[PDB]
C-alpha cells in the first residue's frame, strides 16, 4: 500500500506546484516529504507536516488538513523538478510511502501525445503467444499514465511500460506492451490502450477483426 498522490503535477517556472499525499492513515500520523533525483542523494524536504529542515529553501511550504497532506513549492524552479514521496509511520509496516509524484518544470511548449496501437500478429498467434503494442510519441512533458482495457474494464497483469525517454526533437517517447494468451484476445469484444498526459486522455481501440 502507498496511500495516494498524483503521478504528474507540472508547472511553468515560478508557478506554484501543489502535491497531495492523501489516504486515510493520514489523520493518525504526521507526514514527511522526500525528494528524489538521479545520480544524487535524496533529501528530506519536509518533516512533521509543516517543519522545515536545514538548508532547505523557504519557498517550499507544508501543510495538512483532514485526511490530506500537502507539499507546496511556491515559485518553483528547475532544480525542484524531481520525484516527491510522502512518508507516514505505521505500527506493522514500520513505514508507508507515497505512490510518488513527478514534479515537472517547463520547459518548452506543451505537446499532446501521438498514439499508435498494434494488435497481436498472426505469426505470433500461430506461435501461441499474443502481445498488444501501444506506442506513445512526441509529447511534453515526459509524464504519461498508461492503463489498459479489456472490453472496457482495466487489465491488471501482463502490462509492461517504459519510462518516457527524451528523443532527438526534445520531446518524449514511451511504449506499453500488454501480453495476452491467444484465446484471451479473440474472447473479448475488443481491447483498448489509454494514455493520459496532463489533463487530456486519448484512447486507441482494436478488435480481433
Amino acid at each position: 500500500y502507498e496511500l495516494t498522490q498524483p503521478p504528474s503535477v507540472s508547472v511553468s517556472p515560478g508557478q506554484t506546484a501543489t502535491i497531495t499525499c492523501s489516504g486515510d492513515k493520514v489523520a493518525s500520523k504526521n507526514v514527511c516529504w522526500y525528494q528524489v533525483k538521479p545520480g544524487q542523494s535524496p533529501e528530506v524536504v519536509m518533516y512533521e507536516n509543516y517543519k522545515r529542515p536545514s538548508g532547505i529553501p523557504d519557498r517550499f511550504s507544508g501543510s495538512k488538513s483532514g485526511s490530506t497532506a500537502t507539499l507546496t513549492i511556491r515559485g518553483t524552479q528547475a532544480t525542484d523538478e524531481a520525484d516527491y514521496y510522502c512518508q507516514v509511520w505505521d505500527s506493522f509496516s514500520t513505514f508507508v510511502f507515497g505512490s510518488g509524484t513527478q514534479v515537472t518544470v517547463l520547459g518548452q511548449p506543451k505537446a499532446a501525445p501521438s498514439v499508435t496501437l498494434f494488435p497481436p500478429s498472426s505469426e505470433e498467434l500461430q506461435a501461441n503467444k499474443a502481445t498488444l503494442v501501444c506506442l506513445i510519441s512526441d509529447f511534453y512533458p515526459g509524464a504519461v499514465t498508461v492503463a489498459w482495457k479489456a472490453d472496457s474494464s482495466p487489465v491488471k497483469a501482463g502490462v509492461e511500460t517504459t519510462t518516457p525517454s527524451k528523443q532527438s526533437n526534445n520531446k518524449y517517447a514511451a511504449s506499453s506492451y500488454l501480453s495476452l494468451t491467444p484465446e484471451q484476445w479473440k474472447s473479448h469484444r475488443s481491447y483498448s490502450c489509454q494514455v493520459t498526459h496532463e489533463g487530456s486522455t486519448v484512447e486507441k481501440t482494436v478488435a480481433p477483426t
Binding site: C32, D83, G100, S121, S165
Partner: protein, 217 residues
C-alpha cells in the same frame, strides 16, 4: 560529518543473490538505525529494512522472508542480502540513516547516491521478431521480443528507408528480458507497392532477422 556511500554490482542474474554494502564516514555506529530502501517506477519508493549496532533487525513484512541485513561495527559498514531476485527487484537501492529512539515522526537522513541494480536473465538469448501490420499516412512496425542483453539495432530495408522511422527504447519485463518496437510511418498511397522489411541485428547472440511487413485482409 556523517556521509554514507554504497557499493553494489549493477547487473545481476535472476534467482541469484543480491548483496549490497554501505559505508559510514567518521562517526561510530552510534544512535542510528542503518537502513536500506529502494526506488523505481511501478513499485515506487519502499523501505527494505533497518538494523541497529547491537544486531536488532526490522524488515519490510512483504520482503521479510528474503531480506537479510548485517553490521560490521569493526569495519564501519552495514550490508544487505536479498536472496532469489527477479526483474521486479530491478531498482535504485539507497542506504540511509534513522535516529535511535522514537519512530512516529522520524525520517530517513544522510542518504546515498545510490546504486542502480538491474536484475535480468542468466543467459544470453536472441530476439523473436513479429510484424506490426498497418490499417494521408499509415504506420507499420517491427516487434523484437524477449532478448538479452542490450543492445539491438533495427534498420528498415537495409537502411534504405530512413525517413519516418522511429525505434523506441526497450522494456525490461518480468522474464528478465528486453523487448522493443520500431515503427515507420509511410504513405497510404504506398502499400501493395514498395515492400517494407525489418532488419533486426542482435550481435551478442549472433542473431540477424529480416521480416516482411504487409497488411492482412
Amino acid at each position: 560529518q556523517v556521509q554514507l556511500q554504497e557499493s553494489g554490482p549493477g547487473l545481476v542474474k535472476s534467482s541469484e543473490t543480491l548483496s549490497l554494502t554501505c559505508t559510514v564516514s567518521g562517526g561510530s555506529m552510534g544512535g542510528y538505525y542503518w537502513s536500506w530502501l529502494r526506488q523505481s517506477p511501478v513499485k515506487g519508493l519502499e523501505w527494505i529494512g533497518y538494523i541497529f549496532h547491537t544486531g536488532h533487525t526490522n524488515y519490510n513484512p512483504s520482503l521479510e522472508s528474503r531480506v537479510t541485513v548485517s553490521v560490521d561495527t569493526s569495519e564501519n559498514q552495514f550490508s544487505l542480502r536479498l536472496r532469489s531476485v527477479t526483474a521486479a527487484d530491478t531498482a535504485v537501492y539507497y542506504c540511509a540513516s534513522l535516529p535511535r529512539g522514537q519512530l512516529v515522526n522520524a525520517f530517513f537522513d544522510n542518504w546515498g547516491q545510490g546504486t542502480l541494480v538491474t536484475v535480468a536473465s542468466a543467459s544470453t538469448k536472441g530476439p523473436s521478431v513479429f510484424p506490426l501490420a498497418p490499417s494521408g499516412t499509415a504506420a507499420l512496425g517491427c516487434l523484437v521480443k524477449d532478448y538479452f542483453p542490450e543492445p539491438v539495432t533495427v534498420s528498415w530495408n537495409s537502411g534504405a528507408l530512413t525517413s519516418g522511422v522511429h525505434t523506441f527504447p526497450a522494456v525490461l519485463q518480468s522474464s528478465g528480458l528486453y523487448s522493443l518496437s520500431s515503427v515507420v510511418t509511410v504513405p497510404s498511397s504506398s502499400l501493395g507497392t514498395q515492400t517494407y522489411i525489418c532488419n533486426v541485428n542482435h550481435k551478442p547472440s549472433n542473431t540477424k532477422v529480416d521480416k516482411r511487413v504487409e497488411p492482412k485482409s
